[PDB]
Write a protein that binds this ligand. Structure first.
Ligand SMILES: N[C@@](CCCC[B-](O)(O)O)(C(=O)O)[C@H]1C[C@H]2CC[C@@H](C1)N2Cc1ccc(Cl)c(Cl)c1
Ligand SMILES: [Mn+2]
Ligand SMILES: [Mn+2]
Length: 306
Protein backbone atom coordinates (compact mmCIF):
# COMPACT_ATOMS: atom_id res chain seq x y z
CA UNK A 1 0.00 0.00 0.00
CA UNK A 2 2.94 2.28 0.70
CA UNK A 3 5.57 3.01 -1.94
CA UNK A 4 8.78 4.96 -1.48
CA UNK A 5 10.33 6.59 -4.52
CA UNK A 6 14.05 7.33 -4.52
CA UNK A 7 15.87 9.03 -7.36
CA UNK A 8 19.42 7.66 -7.67
CA UNK A 9 21.16 9.59 -10.40
CA UNK A 10 24.22 7.26 -10.65
CA UNK A 11 26.31 7.72 -13.76
CA UNK A 12 29.73 6.62 -12.55
CA UNK A 13 29.03 2.89 -13.00
CA UNK A 14 29.59 3.54 -16.70
CA UNK A 15 31.10 6.01 -19.17
CA UNK A 16 28.20 7.62 -21.07
CA UNK A 17 26.88 10.98 -19.94
CA UNK A 18 23.18 11.49 -19.32
CA UNK A 19 21.94 8.47 -17.39
CA UNK A 20 21.98 10.65 -14.26
CA UNK A 21 18.95 12.38 -15.81
CA UNK A 22 16.93 9.16 -15.87
CA UNK A 23 15.09 9.81 -12.61
CA UNK A 24 13.87 13.25 -13.67
CA UNK A 25 12.82 11.85 -17.06
CA UNK A 26 10.78 9.13 -15.38
CA UNK A 27 9.13 11.54 -12.97
CA UNK A 28 8.25 13.92 -15.79
CA UNK A 29 6.59 10.99 -17.59
CA UNK A 30 4.06 11.02 -14.75
CA UNK A 31 5.25 8.31 -12.34
CA UNK A 32 3.87 9.75 -9.11
CA UNK A 33 0.32 10.28 -10.35
CA UNK A 34 0.24 6.81 -11.93
CA UNK A 35 1.18 5.19 -8.63
CA UNK A 36 -1.26 7.36 -6.65
CA UNK A 37 -4.12 6.39 -8.96
CA UNK A 38 -3.34 2.75 -8.16
CA UNK A 39 -3.91 3.42 -4.47
CA UNK A 40 -0.24 3.68 -3.50
CA UNK A 41 0.51 5.87 -0.49
CA UNK A 42 3.70 7.64 -1.56
CA UNK A 43 6.85 8.81 0.17
CA UNK A 44 9.06 10.69 -2.28
CA UNK A 45 12.68 10.86 -1.15
CA UNK A 46 13.44 13.05 -4.17
CA UNK A 47 16.77 12.74 -6.01
CA UNK A 48 19.71 11.88 -3.77
CA UNK A 49 22.99 13.79 -3.88
CA UNK A 50 25.89 11.41 -3.33
CA UNK A 51 29.11 12.30 -1.53
CA UNK A 52 32.01 12.72 -3.98
CA UNK A 53 35.36 11.01 -3.36
CA UNK A 54 38.56 12.92 -4.07
CA UNK A 55 41.18 11.20 -6.25
CA UNK A 56 39.06 8.18 -7.16
CA UNK A 57 41.75 6.70 -9.40
CA UNK A 58 40.99 3.62 -11.44
CA UNK A 59 41.34 0.38 -9.57
CA UNK A 60 43.87 -1.89 -11.17
CA UNK A 61 44.27 0.44 -14.18
CA UNK A 62 40.82 -0.73 -15.28
CA UNK A 63 37.86 -0.36 -12.88
CA UNK A 64 36.57 3.17 -13.00
CA UNK A 65 35.17 5.22 -10.16
CA UNK A 66 35.22 2.41 -7.59
CA UNK A 67 35.30 4.63 -4.49
CA UNK A 68 32.59 6.92 -5.88
CA UNK A 69 30.34 4.02 -6.85
CA UNK A 70 31.07 2.26 -3.56
CA UNK A 71 30.23 5.27 -1.41
CA UNK A 72 27.17 6.27 -3.42
CA UNK A 73 25.88 2.72 -3.01
CA UNK A 74 26.59 2.76 0.73
CA UNK A 75 24.58 5.94 1.07
CA UNK A 76 21.80 4.58 -1.14
CA UNK A 77 21.64 1.36 0.87
CA UNK A 78 21.05 3.43 4.00
CA UNK A 79 18.04 5.18 2.43
CA UNK A 80 16.60 1.96 1.00
CA UNK A 81 17.00 0.12 4.31
CA UNK A 82 15.21 2.93 6.12
CA UNK A 83 12.32 3.02 3.63
CA UNK A 84 11.82 -0.74 3.67
CA UNK A 85 12.07 -0.81 7.45
CA UNK A 86 9.29 1.83 7.61
CA UNK A 87 7.04 -0.49 5.59
CA UNK A 88 7.46 0.97 2.09
CA UNK A 89 7.92 -0.97 -1.11
CA UNK A 90 10.98 0.83 -2.43
CA UNK A 91 11.16 2.09 -6.00
CA UNK A 92 14.59 3.35 -7.02
CA UNK A 93 14.98 5.26 -10.28
CA UNK A 94 18.37 5.15 -12.01
CA UNK A 95 20.89 6.02 -12.97
CA UNK A 96 23.12 3.18 -14.12
CA UNK A 97 22.75 -0.39 -12.90
CA UNK A 98 25.65 -0.27 -10.42
CA UNK A 99 23.09 1.23 -8.04
CA UNK A 100 21.60 -2.26 -7.59
CA UNK A 101 24.54 -2.89 -5.27
CA UNK A 102 23.05 -0.29 -2.96
CA UNK A 103 19.36 -1.07 -3.42
CA UNK A 104 19.72 -4.80 -2.97
CA UNK A 105 22.13 -4.41 -0.06
CA UNK A 106 19.77 -1.94 1.61
CA UNK A 107 16.74 -4.09 0.91
CA UNK A 108 18.45 -7.20 2.26
CA UNK A 109 19.39 -5.26 5.39
CA UNK A 110 15.71 -5.35 6.37
CA UNK A 111 14.61 -8.45 4.42
CA UNK A 112 17.42 -11.01 4.45
CA UNK A 113 15.34 -13.73 2.76
CA UNK A 114 14.69 -11.63 -0.34
CA UNK A 115 14.90 -13.04 -3.86
CA UNK A 116 15.83 -11.15 -7.02
CA UNK A 117 14.23 -11.05 -10.44
CA UNK A 118 16.78 -9.45 -12.75
CA UNK A 119 15.29 -8.27 -16.04
CA UNK A 120 18.06 -7.28 -18.43
CA UNK A 121 19.68 -7.89 -21.82
CA UNK A 122 22.81 -8.48 -19.75
CA UNK A 123 23.80 -10.62 -16.77
CA UNK A 124 25.73 -7.85 -15.01
CA UNK A 125 27.75 -10.54 -13.26
CA UNK A 126 31.30 -9.81 -14.38
CA UNK A 127 33.75 -9.51 -11.52
CA UNK A 128 36.65 -7.04 -11.34
CA UNK A 129 38.78 -9.91 -12.68
CA UNK A 130 36.57 -10.70 -15.66
CA UNK A 131 35.20 -7.32 -16.77
CA UNK A 132 36.48 -6.23 -20.17
CA UNK A 133 35.11 -2.70 -19.82
CA UNK A 134 35.93 -1.77 -16.23
CA UNK A 135 32.40 -0.41 -15.86
CA UNK A 136 30.78 -1.26 -12.55
CA UNK A 137 27.30 -1.37 -13.96
CA UNK A 138 28.23 -4.62 -15.64
CA UNK A 139 29.45 -6.12 -12.37
CA UNK A 140 26.91 -5.47 -9.61
CA UNK A 141 25.70 -9.05 -9.18
CA UNK A 142 29.25 -10.28 -8.54
CA UNK A 143 29.45 -8.24 -5.33
CA UNK A 144 26.08 -9.52 -4.10
CA UNK A 145 26.28 -13.27 -4.73
CA UNK A 146 27.48 -15.33 -1.78
CA UNK A 147 28.98 -18.15 -3.86
CA UNK A 148 31.30 -15.84 -5.82
CA UNK A 149 33.07 -13.97 -3.07
CA UNK A 150 36.30 -16.02 -3.14
CA UNK A 151 36.66 -14.84 -6.73
CA UNK A 152 35.84 -11.18 -6.10
CA UNK A 153 38.70 -8.92 -4.99
CA UNK A 154 38.05 -6.16 -2.49
CA UNK A 155 37.65 -2.79 -4.23
CA UNK A 156 38.32 0.54 -2.51
CA UNK A 157 34.99 1.87 -1.21
CA UNK A 158 33.42 -1.59 -1.28
CA UNK A 159 34.44 -2.96 2.14
CA UNK A 160 30.98 -2.24 3.65
CA UNK A 161 29.32 -4.72 1.29
CA UNK A 162 28.27 -8.12 2.57
CA UNK A 163 27.07 -10.51 -0.14
CA UNK A 164 23.39 -11.11 0.58
CA UNK A 165 22.12 -13.23 -2.28
CA UNK A 166 22.58 -16.81 -2.92
CA UNK A 167 22.91 -18.19 -6.45
CA UNK A 168 19.58 -20.02 -6.05
CA UNK A 169 17.85 -16.75 -5.17
CA UNK A 170 18.24 -14.77 -8.39
CA UNK A 171 16.60 -15.43 -11.76
CA UNK A 172 17.44 -13.51 -14.92
CA UNK A 173 14.92 -12.79 -17.66
CA UNK A 174 15.78 -11.29 -21.01
CA UNK A 175 19.39 -12.21 -21.50
CA UNK A 176 20.90 -11.81 -24.95
CA UNK A 177 24.33 -10.26 -24.51
CA UNK A 178 26.42 -12.33 -22.12
CA UNK A 179 30.23 -12.17 -21.96
CA UNK A 180 32.09 -15.51 -22.02
CA UNK A 181 33.23 -15.26 -18.37
CA UNK A 182 29.64 -14.43 -17.40
CA UNK A 183 28.40 -17.52 -19.21
CA UNK A 184 30.94 -19.54 -17.28
CA UNK A 185 29.74 -18.02 -14.01
CA UNK A 186 26.07 -18.64 -14.74
CA UNK A 187 26.74 -22.28 -15.66
CA UNK A 188 29.32 -23.02 -12.98
CA UNK A 189 27.17 -21.63 -10.16
CA UNK A 190 23.91 -23.04 -11.55
CA UNK A 191 22.29 -19.61 -11.75
CA UNK A 192 18.93 -19.87 -13.48
CA UNK A 193 18.12 -17.63 -16.41
CA UNK A 194 15.62 -17.27 -19.21
CA UNK A 195 17.40 -15.82 -22.24
CA UNK A 196 15.44 -14.36 -25.15
CA UNK A 197 15.79 -17.79 -26.74
CA UNK A 198 14.07 -19.38 -23.72
CA UNK A 199 11.28 -16.83 -24.02
CA UNK A 200 10.95 -17.63 -27.74
CA UNK A 201 10.52 -21.30 -26.79
CA UNK A 202 8.45 -21.16 -23.61
CA UNK A 203 6.52 -17.95 -24.00
CA UNK A 204 6.51 -15.31 -21.27
CA UNK A 205 3.68 -16.97 -19.26
CA UNK A 206 5.69 -20.16 -18.70
CA UNK A 207 8.84 -18.12 -18.07
CA UNK A 208 7.12 -16.25 -15.22
CA UNK A 209 5.60 -19.46 -13.85
CA UNK A 210 9.00 -21.14 -13.79
CA UNK A 211 10.68 -18.08 -12.33
CA UNK A 212 8.35 -17.98 -9.34
CA UNK A 213 8.53 -21.74 -8.83
CA UNK A 214 12.31 -21.38 -8.54
CA UNK A 215 12.18 -18.40 -6.19
CA UNK A 216 8.98 -18.70 -4.17
CA UNK A 217 7.84 -22.22 -4.95
CA UNK A 218 8.68 -23.39 -1.42
CA UNK A 219 8.01 -20.31 0.69
CA UNK A 220 6.86 -16.72 0.36
CA UNK A 221 9.77 -14.28 0.05
CA UNK A 222 9.99 -10.55 -0.56
CA UNK A 223 10.81 -9.93 -4.21
CA UNK A 224 13.36 -7.46 -5.50
CA UNK A 225 12.71 -6.64 -9.16
CA UNK A 226 15.81 -5.11 -10.76
CA UNK A 227 14.66 -3.90 -14.16
CA UNK A 228 17.17 -2.63 -16.73
CA UNK A 229 15.24 -0.74 -19.41
CA UNK A 230 17.58 -2.29 -22.03
CA UNK A 231 15.74 -5.58 -21.53
CA UNK A 232 13.20 -4.11 -23.96
CA UNK A 233 13.89 -4.10 -27.69
CA UNK A 234 15.83 -0.97 -28.72
CA UNK A 235 12.87 -0.02 -30.93
CA UNK A 236 10.86 0.46 -27.71
CA UNK A 237 13.59 1.74 -25.37
CA UNK A 238 16.16 3.49 -27.54
CA UNK A 239 17.33 5.93 -24.83
CA UNK A 240 19.79 3.64 -23.05
CA UNK A 241 23.53 3.09 -23.03
CA UNK A 242 23.88 -0.51 -24.16
CA UNK A 243 20.94 -1.37 -26.49
CA UNK A 244 20.85 -4.90 -27.90
CA UNK A 245 18.58 -5.95 -30.78
CA UNK A 246 15.95 -8.64 -30.27
CA UNK A 247 14.62 -7.72 -26.82
CA UNK A 248 11.34 -7.96 -24.92
CA UNK A 249 8.20 -6.70 -26.62
CA UNK A 250 6.03 -4.13 -24.87
CA UNK A 251 3.51 -6.84 -24.04
CA UNK A 252 6.15 -9.18 -22.64
CA UNK A 253 7.49 -6.45 -20.36
CA UNK A 254 4.02 -5.63 -19.07
CA UNK A 255 3.35 -9.30 -18.49
CA UNK A 256 6.51 -9.67 -16.39
CA UNK A 257 5.46 -6.70 -14.28
CA UNK A 258 1.87 -7.95 -13.96
CA UNK A 259 3.06 -11.33 -12.73
CA UNK A 260 5.39 -9.59 -10.27
CA UNK A 261 2.39 -7.64 -8.97
CA UNK A 262 0.24 -10.78 -8.83
CA UNK A 263 2.62 -12.44 -6.35
CA UNK A 264 1.68 -9.80 -3.78
CA UNK A 265 5.34 -10.01 -2.72
CA UNK A 266 7.03 -7.08 -4.48
CA UNK A 267 9.17 -5.33 -1.89
CA UNK A 268 11.59 -3.23 -3.95
CA UNK A 269 12.05 -2.31 -7.58
CA UNK A 270 14.91 -0.77 -9.56
CA UNK A 271 14.27 0.88 -12.91
CA UNK A 272 17.64 1.62 -14.31
CA UNK A 273 19.58 2.75 -17.38
CA UNK A 274 17.14 5.25 -18.91
CA UNK A 275 19.48 7.80 -20.51
CA UNK A 276 17.47 10.56 -22.17
CA UNK A 277 20.61 12.11 -23.72
CA UNK A 278 21.13 9.08 -25.95
CA UNK A 279 17.79 9.60 -27.62
CA UNK A 280 18.10 10.99 -31.16
CA UNK A 281 14.84 12.89 -30.67
CA UNK A 282 12.66 14.17 -27.85
CA UNK A 283 10.13 11.54 -28.93
CA UNK A 284 12.68 8.73 -28.41
CA UNK A 285 13.50 10.09 -24.95
CA UNK A 286 9.88 10.46 -23.88
CA UNK A 287 8.80 7.02 -25.12
CA UNK A 288 11.64 5.41 -23.16
CA UNK A 289 10.56 7.30 -20.05
CA UNK A 290 6.89 6.45 -20.65
CA UNK A 291 7.84 2.79 -20.95
CA UNK A 292 9.68 2.96 -17.63
CA UNK A 293 6.57 4.38 -15.98
CA UNK A 294 4.49 1.60 -17.53
CA UNK A 295 6.78 -1.06 -16.04
CA UNK A 296 6.66 0.47 -12.59
CA UNK A 297 2.90 1.02 -12.65
CA UNK A 298 2.22 -2.52 -13.85
CA UNK A 299 4.50 -3.87 -11.11
CA UNK A 300 2.23 -2.12 -8.60
CA UNK A 301 -1.06 -3.21 -10.04
CA UNK A 302 -1.89 -1.48 -13.29
CA UNK A 303 -3.79 -4.01 -15.41
CA UNK A 304 -4.74 -4.15 -19.07
CA UNK A 305 -8.33 -5.12 -18.28
CA UNK A 306 -9.53 -2.51 -15.81
N1 LIG B 1 28.94 -6.97 -20.01
C1 LIG B 1 29.18 -5.60 -20.50
C2 LIG B 1 27.89 -4.78 -20.60
C3 LIG B 1 27.25 -4.45 -19.27
C4 LIG B 1 26.01 -3.56 -19.42
C5 LIG B 1 25.50 -3.21 -18.02
B1 LIG B 1 23.92 -3.07 -18.02
O1 LIG B 1 23.62 -2.54 -16.60
O2 LIG B 1 23.38 -1.96 -18.88
O3 LIG B 1 23.13 -4.34 -17.97
C6 LIG B 1 30.15 -4.94 -19.54
O4 LIG B 1 30.55 -5.61 -18.56
O5 LIG B 1 30.51 -3.74 -19.71
C7 LIG B 1 29.69 -5.92 -21.92
C8 LIG B 1 31.08 -5.42 -22.31
C9 LIG B 1 31.29 -5.24 -23.82
C10 LIG B 1 30.97 -3.78 -24.08
C11 LIG B 1 29.45 -3.74 -24.28
C12 LIG B 1 29.03 -5.20 -24.34
C13 LIG B 1 28.58 -5.66 -22.96
N2 LIG B 1 30.28 -5.86 -24.71
C14 LIG B 1 30.22 -7.33 -24.77
C15 LIG B 1 31.59 -7.71 -25.23
C16 LIG B 1 32.03 -7.23 -26.46
C17 LIG B 1 33.30 -7.56 -26.89
C18 LIG B 1 34.11 -8.36 -26.10
CL1 LIG B 1 35.74 -8.76 -26.73
C19 LIG B 1 33.66 -8.83 -24.87
CL2 LIG B 1 34.65 -9.87 -23.81
C20 LIG B 1 32.39 -8.50 -24.44
MN1 LIG C 1 21.63 -4.18 -19.54
MN1 LIG D 1 21.88 -3.99 -16.21
Amino acid sequence: HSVAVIGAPFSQGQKRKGVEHGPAAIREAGLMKRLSSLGCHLKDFGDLSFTPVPKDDLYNNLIVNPRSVGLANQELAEVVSRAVSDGYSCVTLGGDHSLAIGTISGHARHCPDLCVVWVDAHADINTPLTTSSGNLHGQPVSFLLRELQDKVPQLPGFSWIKPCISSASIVYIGLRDVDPPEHFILKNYDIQYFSMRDIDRLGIQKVMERTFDLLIGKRQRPIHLSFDIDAFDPTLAPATGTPVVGGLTYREGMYIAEEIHNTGLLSALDLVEVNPQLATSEEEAKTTANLAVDVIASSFGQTREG
